[PDB]
Every structure is written in structure tokens, then in C-alpha cells.
From a paper:
Deletion of P. aeruginosa dsbA1 (that encodes PaDsbA1) elicits numerous effects in phenotypic assays including: inability to process elastase to a mature form; inability to export the Type 3 Secretion System (T3SS), and toxins ExoU or ExoT; impaired ability to survive intracellularly in HeLa cells; loss of twitching motility; and reduced alkaline phosphatase and lipase activity. Consequently PaDsbA1 is a highly significant control point affecting the function of many downstream virulence effector molecules and as such is a potential target for inhibitor development.
For all crystallization experiments we used the E82I variant of PaDsbA1. Specifically Fragment 1 is coordinated by two side-chain mediated hydrogen bonds between the amino substituent of the triazole ring and residues Glu28 (2.99 Å) and Tyr148 (2.92 Å). Additional stabilization is provided by a π-stacking interaction between the triazole ring and amide bond of Val21 –Ser22 (3.55 Å from centroid to Ser22 Cα).
Numbering used by the authors: 5 to 191
The structure:
């Protein structure tokens, strides 16, 4: 019952997906974004209930300044295989504890409190691989033509956000609908 152009738009140039063969769902976010923080209790449980042919990805929006710093922290944690376990703690630190997490040294100190290897965090943060991932994330956001967060993209093809869908639960119902649209498509 959704209308292309209203609750979601279709990208005229679809973007490749991270895991070919699965229906991708991307949430573009920034740890410091209050709406992103407020969306977490809705999107997190939904993301954990997704079927086997769907691949949920968080992608930091690297829109400059502190967004890039926090995004680089995110990618470092993903690379280390620890982001899932400290995800909520980072949001809480920033929004409830008023921690800035604005330099790698501050990040490492905080994250060590959550069990994250400090030396490995710092080495990874400054690594060439993370530089490459930052550039890829920037190029992806440009391709999605995203200008704010949180924003969802399904299968590199459909872009929508909380405002366009009409609320947080509505956003995920819309995601479900678009996932079904893609599952039904011929390949
Ligand atoms: C490509 C990258 C860079 C940085 C972090 C995570 C990723 C994987 S996400 C992705 N890759 N191709 C489409 N798409 N959504």
C-alpha cells in the first residue's frame, strides 16, 4: 500500500550490495545522533529476527568532523569483531554519560573498560585497511544520496527514513515490505 516517491524512493542507479545473494538492509547512522540512539530499541530486536536470506549492515555516515571520528571507531570495532558486544555501551557513553569519544586515545581508554584490546584498537584504527573502508563508506553514502540519519537502504535500491515512513515501527514494516519485493524478484 506504500507509494514509490512517498514513503520510499527507488535509486535510479542501484548500488552493489556487500553480500551478493542476500537481500541487503543498510542502516546509515552516527553514534552521536539522538534520533539514531532513540531508534535503537526498535531496530535492534527487529534486526535480530531477520531470516537467513537477509543481510543487515550498519554503515556509519561519514559526513565530516566528529561523524568521521565516530565512524572510524565503528569500523575499527567491526574489524576487531567486537562492535556487536559494545554497540549499546558506546551509545550509552555518548548520550547518557556525556563522553565525547573524540580522539583515539579517549576511545581506547573507554573501550578497554569494555574489554577491548587497547593496542589492537589503536593499531587497527590507524591502519590502511580502515582508511580504505572509510573511503568505501563515503562513496556508498554518496551513491545512496543520503543527507541525514538514520536512513535505511534496502538491497542498494530503496531509500527511506523515519520521517518518510511515518515513525520507527513504520520504518521497519516498510523495510519488511521492500525485502519481500526483492525476494519475489526474478534473478
Ligand atoms: C563497504 C564498506 C565500507 C565500510 C564499512 C562497511 C562496508 C560494507 S557495506 C557495503 N559494501 N557494499 C555495499 N554496501 N552496503
Amino acid at each position: 500500500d506504500y507509494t514509490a516517491g512517498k514513503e520510499y524512493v527507488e535509486l535510479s542507479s542501484p548500488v552493489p550490495v556487500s553480500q551478493p545473494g542476500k537481500i541487503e538492509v543498510v542502516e546509515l547512522f552516527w553514534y552521536g545522533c539522538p534520533h539514531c540512539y532513540a531508534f535503537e530499541p526498535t531496530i535492534v530486536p527487529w534486526s535480530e529476527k531477520l531470516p537467513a536470506d537477509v543481510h543487515f549492515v550498519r554503515l556509519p555516515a561519514l559526513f565530516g568532523g566528529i561523524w568521521n571520528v565516530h565512524g572510524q571507531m565503528f569500523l575499527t570495532l567491526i574489524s576487531m569483531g567486537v562492535e556487536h558486544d559494545v554497540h549499546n555501551a558506546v551509545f550509552e557513553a555518548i548520550h547518557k554519560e556525556h563522553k565525547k569519544l573524540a580522539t583515539p586515545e579517549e576511545m581506547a581508554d573507554f573501550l578497554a573498560g569494555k574489554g577491548v584490546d587497547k593496542e589492537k584498537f589503536l593499531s587497527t584504527y590507524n591502519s590502511f585497511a580502515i582508511k580504505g573502508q572509510m573511503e568505501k563508506a563515503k562513496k556508498l553514502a554518496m551513491a545512496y544520496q543520503v543527507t541525514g540519519v538514520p536512513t535505511m537502504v534496502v538491497n542498494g535500491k530503496y531509500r527511506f527514513d523515519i520521517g518518510s515512513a511515518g515513525g520507527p515501527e513504520e520504518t521497519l514494516k516498510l523495510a519488511d515490505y521492500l525485502i519481500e519485493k526483492e525476494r519475489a524478484a526474478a534473478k
